[PDB]
Amino acid sequence: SQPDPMPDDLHKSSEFTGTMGNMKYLYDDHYVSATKVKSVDKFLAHDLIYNISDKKLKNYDKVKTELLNEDLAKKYKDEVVDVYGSNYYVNCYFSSKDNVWWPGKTCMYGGITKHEGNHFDNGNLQNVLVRVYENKRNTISFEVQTDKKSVTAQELDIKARNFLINKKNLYEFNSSPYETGYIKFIENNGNTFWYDMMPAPGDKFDQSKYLMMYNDNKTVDSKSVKIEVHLTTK
Amino acid sequence: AAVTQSPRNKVAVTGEKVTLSCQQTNNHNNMYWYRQDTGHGLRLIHYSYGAGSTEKGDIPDGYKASRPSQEQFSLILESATPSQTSVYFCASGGGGTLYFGAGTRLSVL
C-alpha cells in the first residue's frame, strides 16, 4: 500500500488563488455515464472514443477517454463496457494543435469497466461507506451507491465529492472551507492509496492535468472497499 | 447577432439573487463579462476559455460566473448590492475577433 500523507504532501487551498469553481465543476452533479457500449474510434494509441450523448445539456455526442498507456487501451478497445468519469472541455483535443474547439466532444481519463458479469442480480445497488474526518474527527459518514461489483476508484471518488459539495461545501466558487483534503481507499487485501483533493498552488487550475490521475483506471471491489475522506480547516 | 445578453434592463432590490445570461452564436472559445464605469472604461469581472471553466478578471469580488456550454456564459450576483448598479457587457472572442452584447443596465436599490 501507498504511504499516508504528511501535511507537506498536501496541496493547501490557501496557496491556490484561482477560481475553486473550476474544481467544483468537475464533481458537482457532473459525470459521463454509459452502460453496455463499445469504442468506435481513437485518437492516439492510449485513448478510446465512445458514442455517448450528453443527457443533461447537449455538450457532446462523443467522449474520448485516455488510459495510462496503449496496452490499457487495447485491454478495453473491443470490449463491451460501462463508462463512469469526470469529463472536461478546456484543452479537450483530437489532434496536436493547442487551442482548438472540438464541437460535440468531451474528454476524460480511465472510467472503464467490463460490462458482462459486473452487475447485480436485479436493479440492485451496492452501498460503500464513506467516513469523513474533519481535523482528525469523524464528524460525518454516508454511503455512495454503485451498480458495479468492480467499480473504478474514480466513480466512487466522484460520488463522494458530489455529496460533500452539496452537504459540506467542500468546494465553492471562490475557495473552499478546507485547507487540505485527501480521499483514501482501503481495499480488502490491505492495500490503500489516496488522492489529494486540492488544486496545485498558483493562480490557475488545469482540469485536464488534475483528472489525469484517473488514467490508471484503478478498480476496487465495491462490496469490501473502505473510503475515508480527511479534511483540515483553514 | 453575434452576442445576445438578457435581460437588457433590470431593477433589483438589495440582497436578491441576480443572474445575467449571455448567448453567442459564433461559438468563439472565449467569453467575458465586463462592467462599465460610465464616462470611462470596461472593467473585467470574469472570463472563460471554454465550457466548465471561469477565471477572475480585474474586479471579481461580489460576482460568480458559469460557463455551462460553449455558447452560454452567465454572471451571478448572489446577494445584489447598490454598488453593483451599472452597465454590464458580455463579450465573445477568438480567431482574431471580439464581439459585444448590447449591454444590461442594472440598478440595485
From Swiss-Prot, chain A:
It holds the Pfam family Stap_Strp_toxin. Gene3D superfamilies: 2.40.50.110, 3.10.20.120. Keywords: Disulfide bond, Enterotoxin, Metal-binding, Secreted, Signal, Superantigen, Toxin, Virulence, Zinc. Zn(2+) binds at residues 8, 82, 115, 119. It is found in: Secreted. Its main location: secreted. Disulfide bonds join 92-107. One of its GO terms (cellular component) is extracellular region. Staphylococcal enterotoxin that activates the host immune system by binding as unprocessed molecules to major histocompatibility (MHC) complex class II and T-cell receptor (TCR) molecules. In turn, this ternary complex activates a large number of T-lymphocytes initiating a systemic release of pro-inflammatory cytokines. Also causes the intoxication staphylococcal food poisoning syndrome. Belongs to the staphylococcal/streptococcal toxin family. This is Enterotoxin type C-3. The gene is entC3.
